[PDB]
Amino acid sequence: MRGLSRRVQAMKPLVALTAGEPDFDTPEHVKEAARRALAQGKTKYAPPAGIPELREALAEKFRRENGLSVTPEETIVTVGGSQALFNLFQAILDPGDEVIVLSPYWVSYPEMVRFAGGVVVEVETLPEEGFVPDPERVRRAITPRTKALVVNSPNNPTGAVYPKEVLEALARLAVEHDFYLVSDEIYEHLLYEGEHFSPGRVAPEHTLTVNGAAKAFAMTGWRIGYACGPKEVIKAMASVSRQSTTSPDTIAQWATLEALTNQEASRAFVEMAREAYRRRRDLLLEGLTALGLKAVRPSGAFYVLMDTSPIAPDEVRAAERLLEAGVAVVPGTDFAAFGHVRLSYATSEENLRKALERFARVL
Amino acid sequence: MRGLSRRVQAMKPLVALTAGEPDFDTPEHVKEAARRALAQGKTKYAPPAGIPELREALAEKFRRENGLSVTPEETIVTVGGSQALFNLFQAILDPGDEVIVLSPYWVSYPEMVRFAGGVVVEVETLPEEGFVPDPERVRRAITPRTKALVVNSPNNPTGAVYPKEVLEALARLAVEHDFYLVSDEIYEHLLYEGEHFSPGRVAPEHTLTVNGAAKAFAMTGWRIGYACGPKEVIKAMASVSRQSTTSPDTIAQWATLEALTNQEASRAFVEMAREAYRRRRDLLLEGLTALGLKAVRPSGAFYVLMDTSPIAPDEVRAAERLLEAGVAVVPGTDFAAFGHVRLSYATSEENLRKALERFARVL
Ligand SMILES: *Cc1c(COP(=O)(O)O)cnc(C)c1O
Ligand SMILES: *Cc1c(COP(=O)(O)O)cnc(C)c1O
């Protein structure tokens, strides 16, 4: 023994509506590609930035679906979208550098930022404003130390989808003040209304687009993510991978290739899931409204932030009360969504009905 | 844009005998377990420290095969042995802390150490001493800033196997001076003569044992590693995983479980590979001797460090000459094995014969 490092010591330590992954299993066409890979002996080390075939397909995906002008060399395959974010912050942050985070935010953002020595500068997003950021508020938080701004749309945990105008405004601030715009787009296919716009169309040399197969193809356990952006940053990210994970699982990389190239089979899965989620969202929202429980209507992902005022004075107490009632929910504390609890509708309509029933018994 | 971080900027940028992975494909019993996992829908997120079933099997493995007294909670599954090492250094090193590394060393050790802010203190290992460390030399490099000492046996790239007495001496220094002993044991099953001793038997609260399925079961592309040691360090390591990779591939975790529980099928693979490697080693060594090329006889792994004095004045030039001759070798520069080139015998005997033929044409 000797002692743990400071960075590690500074880290923050029934019907369930807490899921952060699809209830659907990964589509058969992807499972098949994995089986073929095993049979073909695709079990050796892959390059740090990923199997070239995948990087090629990734360039086509970002260009075709997102309108991004990228080359295969400006693409990288990682161990989940989480490692894409982690490697990114390790590659661009020096201790002291600031990163603007829009609250409510995904729990992991501030963790990853601080682990690299960065300073988290939180900019609040309001319920009454539909949880869409106000570029003016963001403009006020910019300082000479600002290294990056994190944008996540469709958003976790709000479910909000930022309109193109806002995304363009934020991209302009990055160019204007010379910093990186980190765009987390993993929920792009879980969109019920509106359109998914990619900021990188506007500021390609400032934007690092993070995505992955996780939520879109029900591949959370496969651990395959991807990102694109300025070649020098992508290269730096591959360097961090070389010294940590070496490269993602080779079998999972070949399976993901199938998910991207077999557009027909994947499209069918995406449409099926989206329609299923939409039904669940509507069902949930109607029930909450009927009970007089406030919640901003989500347009993407499979989350809903519910105001817990009528349940208890704070999210923690509210989460406990609902637990007593037989409903597991995620308190919004760690998301900086105080007075709110996060509901996930990636479960059966039956479970959603049972939860609503319980909610009523609590009121 | 804005700029890359200092830590990333400070990173160091035909018959082939350069392989760092087995030429054998992963055994069918492991492939089967993976297929069953897919069929059973084991595709969701796993806990950060790994699937509990695997951690249980890991405790049995370290205890049964290595004589280590560990509990499942003092076990962790990572994305390759490389991430085990990476997370470890991120969890115990503060900028300035020193880490003793025995040269020749595996290229990645100093990279990972510096990335965490540590200082690499290199202690030389001599050819004439069979590349086995001298505890006295190691004792001289210890300072009040020493945080850890890295030991790798069987060794990459030397192939040396350290005798129990030496391992015990090094473990004693760690207790005596109060620092961590990092023992990289991934090549334990690729042993031709002698016995594999685990330092952790002597100093359990000072030793972090790193291992993995990579070289032993020809699973380099599956990316599954594991380690055991002091509960607080293991816990810290799981925390780094939570904020980076989340958890290793779920399918690969279930496949690895089979490799550890089906001792019969795995033992058979290990014995087959070991016998194949032994033959190749002997063949290679005889040929080198016949040509008058010096090389310390390896007892483990599948590497051989060859003295390039008769080929050229330095490894780089020697590597180039051999390349012209149609033989790809790894120059020992990055291993701190100057005047030497690293040969890998994880190929067919035919390719080894062809390489020897070429070597002759060069002399
Ligand atoms: C799922 C998710 C990610 C990345 O997930 P991986 O499972 O690691 O691919 C990143 N951000 C948010 C908001 C997510 O929901
Ligand atoms: C293979 C190896 C490792 C770890 O490899 P993984 O493929 O990441 O499990 C660590 N040290 C040495 C010397 C190795 O040869």
Q: What DSSP letter does each residue of A87-142 carry, written as one string? A: HHHHHH--TT-EEEEEES--THHHHHHHHTT-EEEEEE--GGGTT---HHHHHHH-
Q: Which of B48, B18, B81, B22 is nearest to B241 (CA)?
A: B48
Residue labelled with tokens 């952790």:
B200
Helix (H, G, I), strand (E, B) or coil at A276: helix
Q: How far is CA B22 from the centre of its chain?
A: 13
**Phi/psi class of residue A15: alpha, beta or left (left: φ > 0; alpha: ψ in -120 to 50)?**
beta
User: In whole angstroms, what is the distance from residue B40 CA to residue A25 CA?
Assistant: 10
Is B221 within 8 Å of A42 when comparing Cβ atoms? yes
What type of residue sits at position B353? R
Q: What is the resolution of this structure in A?
A: 2.2
User: In whole angstroms, what is the distance from residue B284 CA to residue B286 CA?
Assistant: 6
Q: How, if at all, do strands A75-78 and A225-228 pair?
A: antiparallel
Is A21 within 8 Å of B178 when comparing Cβ atoms? no
Write down the experimental method used for this entry. X-ray
Distance from CA of B176 to the nearest CA of A (A): 11
Best A251, A334, A344 member to test B by mutation, with max B CBs in 10 Å, is: A251
State whether CATH 3.30.1330.10 applies to domain B1-43+263-362. Answer: no
| Count of CB atoms situated within 10 Å of the CB of B283 | 15
φ, ψ of residue A82 to 5 degrees: the values are -60, -40
> Which ligand is closest in space to the CA of residue B301?
2
**Phi/psi class of residue B38: alpha, beta or left (left: φ > 0; alpha: ψ in -120 to 50)?**
alpha
Supply angle C-alpha A184, A188, A193, rounded to 5. Answer: 130
User: In whole angstroms, what is the distance from residue A115 CA to residue A186 CA?
Assistant: 22
Furthest-apart CA atoms within chain A: distance in Å: 59
User: In whole angstroms, what is the distance from residue A316 CA to residue A252 CA?
Assistant: 38
φ, ψ of residue A137 to 5 degrees: the values are -65, -40
3-state helix, strand, coil in chain B (%, to 5): 45, 15, 40
* Residue A89 CB burial class (10 angstroms; 0-12, 13-18, ≥19): buried
Burial B197-233 (b: 16+ CB within 10 A, else e): bbbbbbbbebbbbbbbbbbbbbbbbbbbbbbbbbeeb
What type of residue sits at position B51? I
φ, ψ of residue A303 to 5 degrees: the values are -125, 155
Q: Which of B303, B334, B308, B337 is nearest to B321 (CA)?
A: B308
Residue labelled with tokens 């046996």:
B153
Partner residues linked to A119 by β-bridges? A98
CATH 3.40.640.10 positions along chain B are 44-262
CB A23 within 8 A of CB A272: no
- Distance in Å from the first CA to the final CA of chain A: 53
User: In whole angstroms, what is the distance from residue B337 CA to residue B332 CA?
Assistant: 5
Q: Which helix (DSSP H) or strand (DSSP E) does residue A31 occupy? A: helix A28-39
Spatial neighbors of A26 by CB under 8 A, at least 6 apart, are: A217, A218, A219, A222, B43
Given A1, A21, A34, which is nearest B206 (Cβ)? A1
Joined tokens for residue A17: 């509506």
CATH 3.90.1150.10 positions along chain A are 1-43+263-362
Q: What angle do the packed helices A80-92 and A231-242 form, to 10 degrees?
A: 110
Residue labelled with tokens 């019920």:
A192
| Count of CB atoms situated within 10 Å of the CB of A12 | 10
| Count of CB atoms situated within 10 Å of the CB of B266 | 20
Joined tokens for residue A343: 């509901």
| Count of CB atoms situated within 10 Å of the CB of A15 | 21
CA distances B190 to B152, B201, B267, B346, Å, are 13, 21, 12, 11
CA of B184 to the centre of ligand 2 (A): 8
Q: How, if at all, do strands B180-184 and B225-228 pair?
A: unpaired
Q: Count CA within 13 A, CB hemisphere, residue B202.
A: 19
User: Which atom of ligand 1 lies closest to the CA of B246?
Assistant: 8
Sign of CA dihedral A44, A47, A53, A59: positive
User: In whole angstroms, what is the distance from residue B226 CA to residue A273 CA?
Assistant: 36
Is A92 within 8 Å of B3 when comparing Cβ atoms? yes
CATH of domain B44-262: 3.40.640.10
Q: Which of B280, B254, B259 is nearest to B270 (CA)?
A: B259
Spatial neighbors of A190 by CB under 8 A, at least 6 apart, are: A154, A215, A216, A273, A274, A277, A300, A301, A302
CB A226 within 8 A of CB A260: no
User: In whole angstroms, what is the distance from residue B83 CA to residue B138 CA?
Assistant: 26
What type of residue sits at position B86? F
Q: Which residue of B has its CA nearest to A78?
A: B245
Burial A32-59 (b: 16+ CB within 10 A, else e): ebbbebbeeebbbbbbbbbbeebbbbbb
Given B35, B115, B221, which is nearest A243 (Cβ)? B115
A82 Cβ inside 6 Å of ligand 1: yes
Partner residues linked to A306 by β-bridges? A295, A341
Is A252 within 8 Å of B248 when comparing Cβ atoms? no
Joined tokens for residue B8: 């990333």
User: In whole angstroms, what is the distance from residue A149 CA to residue B213 CA?
Assistant: 39
Joined tokens for residue B146: 């020493």
Pure H helices in chain B: 6-9, 28-39, 52-66, 80-92, 108-115, 135-141, 164-177, 231-242, 250-261, 263-291, 315-324, 349-361
| Count of CB atoms situated within 10 Å of the CB of B185 | 24
Helix (H, G, I), strand (E, B) or coil at A12: coil
φ, ψ of residue A350 to 5 degrees: the values are -60, -50
Joined tokens for residue A160: 């909000």
Q: How, if at all, do strands B225-228 and B75-78 pair?
A: antiparallel
A248 Cβ inside 6 Å of ligand 1: no
R_g over Cα of chain A: 21
Q: Which residue of B has its CA nearest to A180?
A: B1
* Residue A91 CB burial class (10 angstroms; 0-12, 13-18, ≥19): buried
Q: For chain A, how many helices (H) and strands (E)? A: 12, 12
Spatial neighbors of B63 by CB under 8 A, at least 6 apart, are: B69, B70
Joined tokens for residue B192: 């031709």
